[PDB]
Amino acid sequence: SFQTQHDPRTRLGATPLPGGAGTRFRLWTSTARTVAVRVNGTEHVMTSLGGGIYELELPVGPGARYLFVLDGVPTPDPYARFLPDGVHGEAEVVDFGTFDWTDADWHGIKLADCVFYEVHVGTFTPEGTYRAAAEKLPYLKELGVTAIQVMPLAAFDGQRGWGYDGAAFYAPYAPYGRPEDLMALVDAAHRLGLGVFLDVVYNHFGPSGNYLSSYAPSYFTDRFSSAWGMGLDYAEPHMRRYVTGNARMWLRDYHFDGLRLDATPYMTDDSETHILTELAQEIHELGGTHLLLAEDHRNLPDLVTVNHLDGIWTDDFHHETRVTLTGEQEGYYAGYRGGAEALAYTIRRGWRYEGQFWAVKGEEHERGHPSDALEAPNFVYCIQNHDQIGNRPLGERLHQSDGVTLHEYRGAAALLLTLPMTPLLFQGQEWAASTPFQFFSDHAGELGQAVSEGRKKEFDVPDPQAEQTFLNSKLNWAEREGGEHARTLRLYRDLLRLRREDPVLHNRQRENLTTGHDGDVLWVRTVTGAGERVLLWNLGQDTRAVAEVKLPFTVPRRLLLHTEGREDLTLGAGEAVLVG
Numbered sequence: 001s002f003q004t005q006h007d008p009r010t011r012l013g014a015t016p017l018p019g020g021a022g023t024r025f026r027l028w029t030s031t032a033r034t035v036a037v038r039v040n041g042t043e044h045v046m047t048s049l050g051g052g053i054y055e056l057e058l059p060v061g062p063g064a065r066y067l068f069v070l071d072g073v074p075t076p077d078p079y080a081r082f083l084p085d086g087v088h089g090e091a092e093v094v095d096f097g098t099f100d101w102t103d104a105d106w107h108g109i110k111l112a113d114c115v116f117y118e119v120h121v122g123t124f125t126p127e128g129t130y131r132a133a134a135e136k137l138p139y140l141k142e143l144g145v146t147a148i149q150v151m152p153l154a155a156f157d158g159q160r161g162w163g164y165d166g167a168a169f170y171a172p173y174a175p176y177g178r179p180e181d182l183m184a185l186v187d188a189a190h191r192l193g194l195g196v197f198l199d200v201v202y203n204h205f206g207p208s209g210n211y212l213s214s215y216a217p218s219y220f221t222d223r224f225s226s227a228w229g230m231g232l233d234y235a236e237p238h239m240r241r242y243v244t245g246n247a248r249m250w251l252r253d254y255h256f257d258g259l260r261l262d263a264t265p266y267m268t269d270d271s272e273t274h275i276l277t278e279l280a281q282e283i284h285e286l287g288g289t290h291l292l293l294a295e296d297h298r299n300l301p302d303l304v305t306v307n308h309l310d311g312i313w314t315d316d317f318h319h320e321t322r323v324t325l326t327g328e329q330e331g332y333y334a335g336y337r338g339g340a341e342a343l344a345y346t347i348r349r350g351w352r353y354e355g356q357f358w359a360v361k362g363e364e365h366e367r368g369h370p371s372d373a374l375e376a377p378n379f380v381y382c383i384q385n386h387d388q389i390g391n392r393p394l395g396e397r398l399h400q401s402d403g404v405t406l407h408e409y410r411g412a413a414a415l416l417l418t419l420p421m422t423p424l425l426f427q428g429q430e431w432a433a434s435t436p437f438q439f440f441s442d443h444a445g446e447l448g449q450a451v452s453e454g455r456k457k458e459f460d461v462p463d464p465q466a467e468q469t470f471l472n473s474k475l476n477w478a479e480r481e482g483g484e485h486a487r488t489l490r491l492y493r494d495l496l497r498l499r500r501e502d503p504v505l506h507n508r509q510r511e512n513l514t515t516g517h518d519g520d521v522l523w524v525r526t527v528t529g530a531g532e533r534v535l536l537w538n539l540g541q542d543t544r545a546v547a548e549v550k551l552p553f554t555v556p557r558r559l560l561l562h563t564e565g566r567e568d569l570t571l572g573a574g575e576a577v578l579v580g
C-alpha cells in the first residue's frame with residue numbers, strides 16, 4: 001500500500017504526449033509572477049494550475065529545444081533530460097519510448113553475485129564516451145567482473161570532470177554521448193550478462209548550472225550547507241521528489257540495475273520517513289530487482305535494516321589494508337594500526353569501528369555501531385576506488401605508493417577477491433595500470449581559478465583545471481599486454497575465475513568465515529558443506545613456509561592458487577596462497 005508519488009501525467013519538465021500530440025511542459029515555482037516556455041525560440045505563456053504549478057501542452061516533439069522564462073529571465077529546466085549545449089543552455093525534449101531495447105532476458109543481478117568494476121567514462125578510453133566504453137565490455141566479461149559501477153553522469157559545467165559537480169541530475173553529460181548512446185551501452189552490457197550501476201549525488205548540487213532556486217528557494221535550506229551551496233531541504237516534498245523521480249528515471253528509463261548513493265551521511269532529513277527509506281520505497285515500486293548501495297562512513301547498519309538499502313561501501317577494510325602496506329598515518333589513516341592481526345579483526349567484524357573512540361585529530365567522537373546484523377554481501381570492500389586514489393596529492397595508485405611492492409599488491413587482490421564480502425575494483429587496477437587517477441575539473445572564470453587555488457593550498461600538485469591532469473588520468477590499454485601488467489592481469493583473471501567456480505568460495509555467510517594471524521601472516525578460513533579453503537597472506541619482510549604457520553586447525557594440503565605461481569607452499573615477502 002506504499003503508493004509512488006510520481007505520475008507521468010504530472011511529471012515536471014518536458015514529457016512527450018500520447019497519440020503524437022506533442023509535449024507537456026510543467027514546472028513548479030514559488031516566486032515567479034510571469035511564467036513562459038521558450039520552445040525553438042518562441043515564447044508561450046504557461047497556465048497557472050495553483051500550488052505554483054504551471055503547465056502548457058504544445059505540438060512539438062522529441063528534439064525540440066526549450067527553456068523556461070521566469071519574470072522575463074530565460075532559465076534552464078532543472079528537470080532537463082538532455083543539455084546538448086551544456087548546463088546553461090536549452091534543454092532537448094527526450095522520448096524514452098523510442099530506443100529499441102534488446103535485454104528482455106536480462107533480470108538484474110543480486111548483490112551477492114556482484115564484483116564491481118568502477119569506470120569513469122571520460123578517462124576509461126581515449127575517446128572518453130559511452131560508445132568507446134561499450135567496446136570494452138567483452139574484455140570486462142572475459143576478465144570476470146559482473147557489474148560495472150559508472151561514476152556520476154548528471155550534467156556538470158566544463159568539458160571534463162569526475163561527476164561530483166553534477167547540476168542537472170536528469171540530463172546525462174553531453175560530452176560522453178547522447179541519451180541513446182548511454183542506452184546502447186547498458187543494452188550491450190546486459191546482452192553480455194553484466195550489470196550496470198550508477199553513482200548518484202543526492203547530497204549536493206555542483207556550483208555551476210543548478211537553477212532550482214530560481215524556481216523556488218524552498219528546494220534548499222539555510223539550516224545547513226553543502227560544499228557548494230545551501231543544503232538540500234528534504235522536508236520539502238518537491239525536493240524529495242526531485243531525487244526519487246531521478247532515481248526512478250535511471251532505473252526504469254535507462255535500465256540501470258542499481259544506484260550507488262554518494263555521501264549518504266550528508267543527506268540530512270528529520271522527516272518521519274527518512275529520504276533514504278522513501279528512495280528505497282520508490283525504486284522498489286518499479287517492480288524490478290534494482291539495488292541501492294550507500295557510500296556511508298558512519299558504520300551504521302540501520303542503512304540496511306531500517307532504510308532497506310542493499311549494502312554499504314565500507315572503507316575500514318580499505319584503510320586497514322593501505323596502512324598495512326604503506327605505514328602511512330596522515331588524516332583518517334591515523335585511525336588504523338594495520339598489520340595481520342588488525343586486518344584479521346577488521347574482516348571478523350566487517351568494519352573496525354563499532355562505537356569505539358575515533359581519535360583522529362579534528363574528528364574525535366565515538367564512531368560506529370555493532371555490525372552483527374549485516375551479512376557478508378552487505379559490506380562492499382575495495383583496495384582502490386576513485387576517492388582513495390584521487391584524493392592523494394599526485395593521484396597515485398596503491399602499487400605506485402612509496403614502499404609498496406607488486407607482490408604485496410597481488411597479495412591484496414587475492415585477499416579482496418576471495419572474501420565473501422562484495423568486492424569492487426577500480427578501472428585499470430587489474431593490470432597494475434601505470435597512470436594515476438588525478439582530480440580534474442573544467443570550471444569557468446573565477447570559479448575555475450578558485451578550484452586551482454583551493455587544490456594548491458590543501459596540500460608539485462597537478463592543477464585540476466589543466467587539460468594535462470585529465471589526459472594523464474586516461475587509461476593506457478596497450479600496456480596490459482606486457483611485462484608485469486600482463487602478469488598482474490593473469491592473476492586477476494585467475495582470482496575472478498576461482499571466485500566464480502570454487503564451490504567453497506561461493507560462501508556468503510559470515511558464520512562460515514574465521515580469521516586470525518601468526519606474526520605477520522594473515523589467515524582467512526572458509527568452511528562449508530562443500531569443503532574448506534584457507535587464504536594465507538605473508539605481510540612480513542621475510543619468507544614463511546606454510547608448514548610452519550601456527551594455526552588453530554589443520555591446514556588444507558592442496559595448493560589452489562599462489563599469487564606468484566610458485567609450486568611449493570612457501571610465501572615470499574608480501575605473497576599469498578589459497579589452499580583447500
Ligand SMILES: OC[C@H]1O[C@H](O[C@H]2O[C@H](CO)[C@@H](O)[C@H](O)[C@H]2O)[C@H](O)[C@@H](O)[C@@H]1O
Binds near residue numbers: 328340
Ligand atoms: O616502524 C615504526 C612503526 O611500527 C608500527 O607500524 C608498522 O607496523 C604496522 C603493524 O604493526 C604496520 O601496519 C605498519 O605499516 C608499519 O609502519 C607502529 O604501528 C607505528 O606507530 C610505528 O611508527
Ligand SMILES: OC[C@H]1O[C@@H](O)[C@H](O)[C@@H](O)[C@@H]1O
Binds near residue numbers: 052
Ligand atoms: O508555496 C506553497 C507550497 O508549495 C508546496 O506545495 C510545497 O510542497 C510546500 O511545502 C509549500 O508550502
Ligand SMILES: OC[C@H]1O[C@@H](O)[C@H](O)[C@@H](O)[C@@H]1O
Binds near residue numbers: 297
Ligand atoms: O569517504 C569518507 C571518509 O571521510 C572521512 O572524513 C572520515 O573520517 C572517514 O571515516 C571516511 O573514510
Ligand SMILES: [Mg+2]
Binds near residue numbers: 518
Ligand atoms: Mg609466530
